Symmetry: C8
Subunit: 232 residues, 8 copies
């Protein structure tokens, strides 16, 4: 409920793909398979592949990827640097949604709990009676931890006690990730290109004005033949 | 509830047929027949035929299919190319809603669960007591899995344990589909036609201006006889 | 609740009679009589007569049925064609609400369940104990199926198991109907009349301009006598 | 709850007296007396007298009933025809709310259930044990049917089974009424008066312009004496 | 809850005192004293005195009662007729809220139930065992009827059975009152004064224009001395 | 809940201090001390001192009390009459909120119940067993009546039966108060001063115009030195 | 819930710091320590230090404290009086929020209950059995009174009976405080400085005009060099 | 719920990073690990590192950090003081969100409770029976205090009694922090730079005007070649 609450708060306070990723996470039915073989795969996949898809999507939604591939494809493109600058700007704009997804899914330690439960060392939580049993038997039990309606072995492991531990580890990792990302962003904004920016601004203005003028002249050239044919 | 939540979030953030398909799924009463003979048929049908209907509908709602069939029907149409371009644009605009429907119904593994439950290999979930019994007897039991109010054989198969497994497989398939679709869209937007676009823009502007001029001249030609007849 | 949800979604997204029929269905208290003699009649009636009433209503709400009957009544009407075109347009606009009603009431298999329950062949659901009894005794029991608060014979037939079966059949029929209707609409929009359209547009513009001019000249002719009489 | 839902839907979609009657029904506490002597009277009264009051009210709210009675009262009124046309238009506008009330109260078979329960033939619902008893004893029991908190004789008659039967009959009668009304409206709009309409339009415009001119000239004639007296 | 629902519906659809009286009733804590001596007094008082207060209030809120008493007080007032017309108009505008209050409190048979319960003849509801006991003992019991939390003698009288009876009588009286009021309003609007209306319109326009001119000339006469004193 | 409901209704329908007092009452935690010594004091205090504070507050919020005390303080004030008129107008505007508070707190008989419970004569409610006991013992019991969670002596006095009685008395007193206040307001508006009103209107317009002119001339006199100093 | 209700009512009716303090109180988790040593300290602290912080905050948020300290710091400031007037106005504007906080926290007798419970004389509430025991033992019990989930000694002291008593005392103190504050405000507004007000108004207008002129001239002086450098 | 309530109140009343930090806290799932080794670390981390990240973020979001690092990097920057002033202004604007976070997380004593529970001296709460046991055994029990669903040793320590104590200490620390911060802010606003402010204002206006002029001249220079190329 906290995720939906912050979603509504972000909507009220309200570049846009961030809210898209947040909403998609808050409305995605995370279901851990709760099996010793697919737990790790499912957790790491939910952690890894959605940001990759968001990266690709952010590249696709960009309106000027066509000019980029056109210039990269030609031997001598009609300058040499606005291309690198435009590509860097596109990549930087696209990298936002994956980072938001990773941060959200780490602060909410569901993927971490699903992925690292079967193999983690939970020895302070395992009951004192069954403190000597094969780790192969512990594998299934620990894998069933992230499932409330499946874990029916409270006599061996306290579920909430290990859930809180793993979730705290996940939140620590999330805050570390956020700090590193913010430091990198600070360095980037403090270091980084002057002529390329002006050239790109000019080319964008030129494209817009050309499109508008083309629409206008098409309308004017159509009005004449319209008056000609209608009078028939 | 997550589907309706993301529906409301999409409505708040808000080409339109995507929201139409999402809403239609979130408000469609999926009822698995829970029978070994019609489970597969019903699941695959819900997966397959609604996107076909959405494709046809998107073709019908298009305002310029009439000109397409008129030109395809004539021996020598009044150019050759803008037709192929217009048809490709129509098809690309129409293909959006089916993809959204398939993605949604795969992320929510209801159709997958209904379709693949009776024949899947659920051997780690079947109880150890009835681990040796005819697969024909297992057919009905496994078919009854997606039905909460019908599956009354908890002593043979854990329902939730297999539900999570099949739903995880469905979500994996959904993410794979999304990745492939995004890659194809990236390639299409990066590869693909210059004169046809301008010709289509000009023809659209001409049609609009002609319609507006016709309305205007009809009003002007009517005003005279109106003043003539009213004075009687 | 799904019907009301999609009603609200359609209202938010928002020719109008479609929403009218959807709302009327979502707010109509469908009560199956649950009797072997009136079940079929009630179900088929709810399926058939409301779309007929919607058809008639859509014909009545049309603002230019009077001109149609005036021209059809005269021996020589003041052209021949715009009449057929206007009538076809009226019929096509009117046929929308009945189709929406039928589609909605088929996707929600209440009418189908009420109509086909007493006579359908439910042999896989009838308990194995009373698997040999007179179909006349089965008539009342099966007729009582669509009534939750009346069906008190769970020892003979599983209610939900047959409800899901009949509802799935109804949804299949609904999707078939939708596909056929969409194909017919595609063919109609792709095949079908050029002069009649322009003539109808001109006549509509003429009628509107004449009405407006009549209002204006009435006001002007009234102002004089108003100034005359007020000064008394 | 369905009536209030459709009330809100009609409000959202939104001549006005229709919504007034619908709201008044949805907010009127229908209380069947549940007595063999007053059941019929109360049901038929709720069915009959509210539409009569709505008819009278619609006549009263009409702004030009005074001119109608003034002309009907004079020996030679200052034309002959616009009176009949104005009266017919008033009656047609007024007849809307009673029809809406009757349709609503028939689709919701409360009045029908209250009125026809004590005397209807409910022989398939009366228990097999007391299948031979004086109809005078059955009178009170059947009269108590529409009262949930009063009918405490479930061992003699199944309440819901007869409630559904009578409600289905009421809904059939309601749909029949709607069909007949729609057919009559279609015939009226298709048959029916040309000069009277123009005369009424002109007289209405004249009245409006005269009122506006009178207000203006009153203000102008007052301004002079205002400037005269204020300066004192 | 029905009263508040219709209150909200009236607010949504939305001379104003009608809504005021409706709201005041829907938010007034009607508490029957449930005593054989004060029941009648309290019921009749709630029925009678609030409309009297509403009448007085509607007279007070009227902006031109001062001119009425000024002219009625003078021996020779500065015409004779517009006074009677203005007074009749004031009374007619004021009489709306009391009628609405009476209609509402009669349709909701609380006052009727509180007032007429102790003395009404409820012989078909009194149990057959205590069918022979002093009416003085029946007085207290019947008086306690409108109180749910006080009436603890279900073995002598069925509370709901008599509540429905008295409430039905109250609703009948309410509909009769509404019909009579509507008939009287129809007769009044059909019968009833020509010069007085114009004179009142002119006097109102004159008063308004004089007030506006006085404000304007006060501002103009103040501006001069303002410019004079500010410069000091 | 009725008080908050009417608060919301008044807010929707919406001199302002009336709503302020209503809101303050609906959001004030009335806690009867339920002791034989402080009950009367607390009830009468809640009845008396909040209207006094509202009176004082309404006097303070008035924007022209300073001119009143300035003129009352001087031996010869710069006319004699507009002072009495302004003071009367201020007092009349201020007297609204106390009356609203008293009316509200009387219609909701909480203060009356808290104040008059310990000493009232409740002899028809005291049980027949303890009908002969010292009034000093009855004092505490009756004082505990307005407290639901404290009154634990149901065997001696029926709590609700006396609560309804006292609340009915309170509502009677409230309606009497409202009637008397409305009669007094009618007499005041019908009796009551002509030159003083015009003088006050003129002085108010003069004050407003002087303030506006002073602001304007301050801005103009500042602009010059602004242009002078900025250029440095 | 009453505090939040009045918060919403104040928001709907809606110098601003008053609502800030009200909201901060309604959303502050008051937790009495329920210990004989820290109860008094915590209660008095919640009563005393938040208004001090609000006073300081209101001083800080004031936009012209800098000019005040600048003039107070100089030996001969560039007049003598507007400083005292500006300081008095600042203090009066700042004193609003602390008074609102104190009034709110006194009307809601939580701080009073927490502070005065351990040492108050509650002898009419202590049970008759333990009416002779060391006050040191009574200290802990009485201190635990404001805690619902901690006070588990109902056999010695009735919790609600003393809670109501102390809360009534707190409300009395709150009303006394409000009356005294209103009287002081009345005296202040009736007594209190003519030239200082005009001087402050003029200085404020001058500051505003100077700021606006400076922005304008900065823009104009920048435009020239902008046109100069851009053309390079 | 109080935090979300004040969040909504702040949103309604509504430099922006304050609301961001408040929302992020109200929607952050604080999960104390409830272990004697990681409790302190987790609590202090939640207290310390989020404000550091907010500080860095506020530095990054600042639009003119690039000019700061450009001037700090050059040997002789194109003045010497607007840099120090701009840096101080940036730091002061950035320091807001960390302070809000610390204040919020201290008023809501969750971090304090998680951090200081295992080592605090809770001797008045430990039961009298186990008042002599190794502090190593008390370590785990006290560490489990902030966990409602884990602390299952009510026979040794009263959970709520110590929770209230530690939360009161946390609130005291929070109010102390707020007072110190407000005093420092008062001193800063009262002490602190005249030429630097004007220079920064001028440079900002110059930058804005230059950007706008550059956009304009780019559009004008593009229009010519647009008209040139379109005509081809
Ligand atoms: C540990 O196991 C014993 C029996 O083996 C059981 O009684 C006890 O409740 C268990 N405790 C926990 C914490 O699992
Ligand atoms: C397996 O079956 C046995 C009896 O056959 C039953 O006692 C046990 O609960 C079952 N377990 C599961 C997981 O189905
Ligand atoms: C079938 O009938 C038997 C007795 O005739 C009963 O025990 C059993 O529960 C019934 N089963 C079903 C599925 O109706
Ligand atoms: C019919 O009456 C018998 C006894 O007379 C009773 O046992 C049975 O439940 C009743 N059945 C119905 C349907 O009323
Ligand atoms: C009538 O009274 C008898 C005993 O006097 C009791 O058993 C019965 O339930 C009562 N019935 C009603 C309807 O009050
Ligand atoms: C009156 O008191 C008797 C015993 O003294 C008790 O049984 C009875 O219930 C009481 N009745 C009321 C109405 O208090
Ligand atoms: C007073 O104490 C006695 C026993 O000491 C107990 O029975 C009684 O309920 C108590 N009463 C109150 C009001 O505490
Ligand atoms: C203290 O411990 C005793 C037994 O050791 C137990 O009976 C009692 O309830 C405990 N009390 C508290 C307050 O923990």
């Amino acid at each position: 409920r906290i995720m939906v609450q912050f979603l509504q708060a972000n909507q009220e306070s309200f570049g846009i793909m961030a809210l898209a990723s947040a909403q998609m996470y808050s409305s995605f039915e995370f279901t851990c398979p709760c099996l010793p073989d697919y737990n790790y795969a499912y957790g790491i996949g939910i952690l890894i592949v959605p940001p990759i898809w968001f990266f690709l999507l952010g590249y696709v939604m960009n309106n000027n990827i066509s000019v980029l591939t056109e210039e990269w494809k030609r031997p001598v493109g009609k300058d040499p640097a606005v291309l690198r600058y435009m590509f860097s700007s596109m990549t930087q704009r696209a990298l936002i949604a994956p980072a938001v997804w990773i941060a959200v899914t780490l602060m909410d330690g569901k993927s971490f709990l699903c992925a690292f439960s079967p193999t983690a060392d939970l020895s302070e939580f395992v009951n004192e009676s069954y403190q000597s049993l094969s780790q192969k038997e512990l594998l299934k039990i620990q894998a069933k931890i992230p499932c409330k309606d499946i874990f029916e072995e409270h006599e061996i492991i306290s579920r909430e006690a290990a859930t809180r531990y793993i979730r705290c580890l996940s939140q620590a990792c999330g805050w570390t990730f956020l700090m590193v990302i913010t430091l990198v962003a600070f360095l980037v904004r403090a270091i980084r290109t002057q002529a390329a920016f002006l050239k790109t601004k000019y080319w964008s203005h030129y494209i817009d004005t050309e499109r508008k003028l083309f629409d206008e002249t098409c309308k004017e050239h159509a009005k004449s033949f319209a008056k000609v044919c209608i009078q028939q």
